[PDB]
């Protein structure tokens, strides 16, 4: 969209030989779409239990604020889990270390994860020319984005919704620290009384 | 006894230094061996210096310990 006031997509930055530094257009786009997908997953998971808890779709005894699930035990930790939060943290570390290290190894060498045997999943782990956009029999298991016009339309839609989720997770954290309740509670407060429940009033309130 | 105890170690140090000096001076561009030490040969001389007084005595006897002044830099007074 041409919004580069500081300037970090210049090809003159990190010019020469070797693998170089992080300020380069390829890594910048890679990290942009990775932050976008992670922010969209986070924005889905932060408010998804809240709306279903207000509507009673899922049990409200499990529906808790996203910062009280165990991510911040000072804020709150959910006791009624099948495992302790550190056990789930170790499971997370093993699984996502595997995932992100395979991603990094494919980023350094494209298509290299389809050569070393991994449970017969090498067919899914080939990727494309863009390391950010792997595709294949799993990452794009439904073909969906086949023709280049609608593929580029889906690209623009994905990057726009991810850029929205940037500000969504930013506001989620900011509202969580200034107010201490869930984002949907903040939305209900802004809907019920906009002037009485906004930034101006909440900055002069408790816990913020 | 501690006089000989010190003198044994002092002769040990002097003898292994002398052995390294001779065995380094017979090598091409020998000035780098003093700043770039070699560990296997220095350790081999380090564990061969127990009989330092016998080696020093035999080197004095055969004349290889000392050197002819003819080959020693002498101040021109």
């Amino acid at each position: 969209y041409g919004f580069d006031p500081l300037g970090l997509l210049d090809p003159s930055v990190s010019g020469g030989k070797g693998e170089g530094g992080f300020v380069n257009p390829r890594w910048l786009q890679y990290s942009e779409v990775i932050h976008a997908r992670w922010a969209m997953l986070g924005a889905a998971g932060c408010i998804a239990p809240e709306i279903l808890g207000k509507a009673g779709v899922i049990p409200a005894e499990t529906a808790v604020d996203w910062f009280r699930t165990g991510v911040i035990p000072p804020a709150g930790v959910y006791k009624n889990f099948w495992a302790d939060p550190f056990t789930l943290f170790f499971i997370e570390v093993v699984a996502i270390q595997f995932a992100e290290l395979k991603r990094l190894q494919d980023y350094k060498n494209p298509g290299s994860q389809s050569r070393q045997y991994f449970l017969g999943l090498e067919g899914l782990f080939k990727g494309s020319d863009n390391p950010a956009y792997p595709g294949g029999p799993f990452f794009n298991f439904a073909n969906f984005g086949k023709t280049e016009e609608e593929m580029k339309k889906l690209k623009l839609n994905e990057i726009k919704n991810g850029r929205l989720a940037m500000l969504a997770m930013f506001g989620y954290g900011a509202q969580a620290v200034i107010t201490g309740d869930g984002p949907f509670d903040n939305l209900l407060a802004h809907l019920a009384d906009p002037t009485g429940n906004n930034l101006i009033t909440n900055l002069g309130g408790k816990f913020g | 006894i501690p006089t000989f105890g010190f003198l044994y170690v002092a002769g040990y140090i002097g003898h292994v230094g002398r052995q390294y000096i001779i065995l380094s001076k017979e090598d091409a561009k020998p000035t780098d061996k003093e700043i770039i030490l070699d560990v296997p040969l220095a350790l081999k001389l380090a564990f061969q210096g127990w009989a330092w007084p016998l080696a020093s005595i035999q080197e004095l006897r055969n004349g290889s310990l000392l050197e002819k002044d003819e080959n020693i830099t002498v101040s021109p007074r």
Partner: protein, 740 residues
């Protein structure tokens, strides 16, 4: 215009240049034929100017050098935090700071060192430390050793990150020359970003963490039941009872009702009577104001968005008629010479370290720091010496810039060229005022010595006899004492108790009391002015005559550090700017030694002491007023009246101070061999020793050579400074620990 220009992978990461120690210089890349090659290897190691002529490689080298120094400093700080966490009595010291001496170094019981583990109290034995780290860890809210452990681990992690940053920013992604030449961006980011952001972060930490912990600490609450700072950070109810302004909860900040924050952002003069240090609310408002003042200052220069200031335009715009061209070529000088920037930064860093020493002996910013006389004296002396060394190095690197990076084509009638043009006038007037200050600062002492020895005390330059009253200093003291009454009506008390009228005391020992200035103080201050004027004369003469002189017109072609130009013209020894700095080290040593002697005697005679019900008794019975007017009085009543505990420290906890004292005497005395002697005698002695080693064939392949004349001067001045500094360190610490 300002962008991030970075070259990726200019230097391969391998140990190829580690195998050959001489690789930075082509002269040292051949081999060590003589023994002076090793000294040239360790001397030209970081001199990046003669390694290569490219400024970009020099900039990358110094960037990663600063990264390595930052990593080293972080390693040392993390080690100090680890020592406070593991081998310390900090938990005991928190419950009793007025009776338990601080300790953070524990020696091993290997050989006789169990006597060095002195009984510092609290069921703990170890070295009584002097850095004041316990006071700092009481200022910032720190209760248990677990927090010190966490700080140490974080410091180690940041040190590893800094070393990795240096490796990356040199070997992996090295910035270009235009990246370093963005002076406006550097100034903006280090004014608003570094200084301002650090001041704001420390203000926030003091407001949310240090203020409640310190408010509960001096109220008699034990640190065990003091709530952890995260409880203050998360819960507004706990922070609301200690400070009722927190109940409003950031409402007065955005509504410009900052007067409601007058409970924890106070404007109070003096010290906290419970602890003896500055009020933490005053420091919080201080660092907040500093953060605001540096954030506005960091948006001054123009970088990329049109608005701002151009430094070249500012320099070229200030031109006044008696100066010709004014600041015309200084921007090009400071954007192309690392040494000129090094000189300016080192001079200002040294001066600000001097300011730090003065302004923390005057206003102690830490709880239970004023009563701890050892920590205050050690901090003052240490930052005294660091500032003096940095100023001498500033003179040295200014002379190096003058020799190397100066070009006469760029500047013709600028300020610098006119400074070189009238350098003889500057040096002559500085010599005149130096001699005048020496006479009317030291002949007064010699005259007082004589009339004392002539049995005529009524002819003295003393208070009892005719006097030189420091009227200006006393008037400034009276103005600053009456400053809160009229000129600063919102201040609760005076900014310091140097000029005050109240004697604060913690634990029965005087924290800070008013200082009376008399004839002896006038004499010592004018001696200080004389000594600093002579030292700046030496350094400026070295800087000014580095390029050329009436003696040697081609001194520029001889380099910065050369021994001499031969015995011609009567003998041009020590004619280089390096030797001028070499003498400047000694003169700064003399100046700072007299300064710290004045500080120690003045504090121990008129400030430090134990308060009683009937008056106040000092450490020494007011001997500075009647004994600091003569050199013999100075000697007998300062260096002989004290130092009786250093010699009698054997068999006690301070015996290591006596050992350090005598070893420092040795090193100071050993230096004079390298200072009086030359090289030819030592070279001939080395020739005789080479003959001796040649007789029985133990001749080294590397030819033994005597140290160079510049090398010999460097060794002599280094051993002299080390001996003198360690002598004063041992004497001061043993005297202030065995008594204070």
């Amino acid at each position: 215009k300002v962008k991030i220009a970075v070259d990726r992978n200019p230097v391969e990461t391998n140990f190829e240049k580690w195998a050959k120690p001489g690789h930075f210089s082509r002269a040292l890349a051949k081999g060590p034929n003589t023994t002076t090659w090793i000294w040239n290897l360790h001397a030209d190691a970081h001199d990046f100017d003669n390694h290569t002529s490219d400024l970009e490689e020099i900039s990358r080298k110094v960037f990663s050098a600063h990264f390595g120094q930052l990593g080293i400093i972080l390693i040392w700080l993390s080690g100090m935090y680890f020592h406070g966490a593991r081998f310390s009595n900090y938990e005991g010291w928190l419950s009793d700071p007025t009776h338990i001496k601080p300790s953070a170094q524990v020696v091993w019981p290997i050989v006789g060192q169990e006597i060095l583990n002195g009984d510092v109290g609290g069921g703990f034995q170890g070295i009584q430390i002097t850095s004041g780290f316990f006071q700092l860890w009481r200022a910032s809210g720190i209760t248990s050793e677990l927090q010190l452990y966490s700080t140490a681990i974080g410091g180690l992690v940041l040190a590893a990150a800094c070393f990795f940053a240096g490796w990356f920013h040199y070997h992996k992604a090295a910035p270009k020359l235009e990246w370093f030449q963005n002076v406006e961006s550097m100034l903006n980011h280090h004014l608003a970003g570094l200084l301002g952001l650090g001041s704001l972060a420390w203000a926030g930490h003091q407001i949310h963490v240090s203020l409640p912990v310190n408010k509960l600490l001096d109220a008699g609450v034990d640190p065990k039941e003091i709530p952890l700072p995260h409880e203050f950070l998360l819960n507004q109810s706990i922070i609301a009872d200690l400070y009722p302004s927190f109940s409003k909860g950031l409402a007065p900040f955005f509504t410009l009702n900052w007067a409601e924050y007058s409970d924890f952002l106070t404007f109070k003069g003096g010290l906290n009577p419970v602890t003896g240090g500055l009020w933490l609310s005053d420091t919080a408002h201080h660092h907040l104001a500093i953060a605001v003042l540096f954030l506005v200052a960091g948006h001054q220069y123009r970088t990329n968005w049109g608005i701002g200031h151009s430094i070249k335009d500012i320099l070229e715009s200030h031109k006044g008629p008696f100066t010709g061209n004014g600041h015309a070529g200084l921007y090009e000088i400071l954007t192309t010479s690392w040494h000129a920037q090094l000189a300016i930064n080192l001079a200002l860093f040294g001066s600000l370290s001097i300011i730090v020493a003065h302004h923390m002996y005057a206003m102690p910013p830490y709880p239970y720091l004023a009563t701890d006389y050892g920590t205050q004296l050690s901090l003052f002396t240490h930052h005294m010496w660091i500032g003096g060394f940095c100023v001498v190095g500033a003179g040295a690197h200014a002379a190096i810039f003058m020799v190397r990076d100066y070009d006469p084509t760029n500047n013709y009638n600028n300020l610098l060229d006119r400074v070189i043009r009238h350098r003889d006038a500057i040096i002559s007037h500085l010599n005149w005022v130096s001699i005048f200050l020496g006479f009317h600062s030291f002949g007064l002492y010699i005259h007082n010595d004589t009339m004392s020895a002539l049995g005529r005390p009524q002819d003295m330059f003393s208070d009892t006899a005719i006097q030189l009253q420091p009227v200006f200093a006393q008037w400034i003291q009276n103005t600053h004492f009456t400053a809160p009454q009229l000129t600063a009506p919102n201040a609760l008390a005076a900014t310091s108790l140097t000029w005050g009228g109240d004697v604060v005391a913690v634990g029965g020992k005087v924290a800070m009391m008013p200082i009376a200035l008399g004839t002896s103080d006038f004499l010592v201050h004018h001696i200080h002015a004389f000594t600093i004027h002579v030292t700046v004369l030496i350094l400026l003469k070295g800087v000014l005559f580095a390029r050329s002189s009436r003696l040697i017109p081609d001194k520029a072609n001889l380099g910065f550090r050369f021994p001499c130009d031969g015995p011609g013209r009567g003998g041009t020894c020590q004619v280089s700017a390096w030797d001028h700095v070499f003498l400047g080290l000694f003169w700064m040593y003399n100046s700072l030694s007299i300064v710290i002697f004045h500080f120690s005697w003045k504090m121990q005679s008129d400030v430090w002491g134990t308060v009683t019900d009937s008056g106040v008794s000092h450490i020494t019975g007011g001997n500075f007023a009647q004994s600091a007017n003569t050199i013999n009085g100075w000697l007998r009543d300062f260096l002989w009246a004290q130092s009786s505990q250093v010699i009698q420290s054997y068999g006690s906890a301070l015996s290591a101070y006596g050992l350090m004292f005598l070893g420092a005497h040795f090193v100071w005395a050993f230096s004079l061999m390298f200072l009086f002697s030359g090289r030819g005698y030592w070279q001939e002695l080395i020739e005789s020793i080479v003959w001796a080693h040649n007789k029985l064939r133990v001749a080294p392949s590397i030819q033994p050579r005597a140290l160079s004349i510049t090398q010999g001067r460097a060794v002599g001045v280094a051993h002299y400074l080390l001996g003198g500094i360690a002598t004063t360190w041992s004497f001061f610490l043993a005297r202030i620990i065995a008594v204070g």
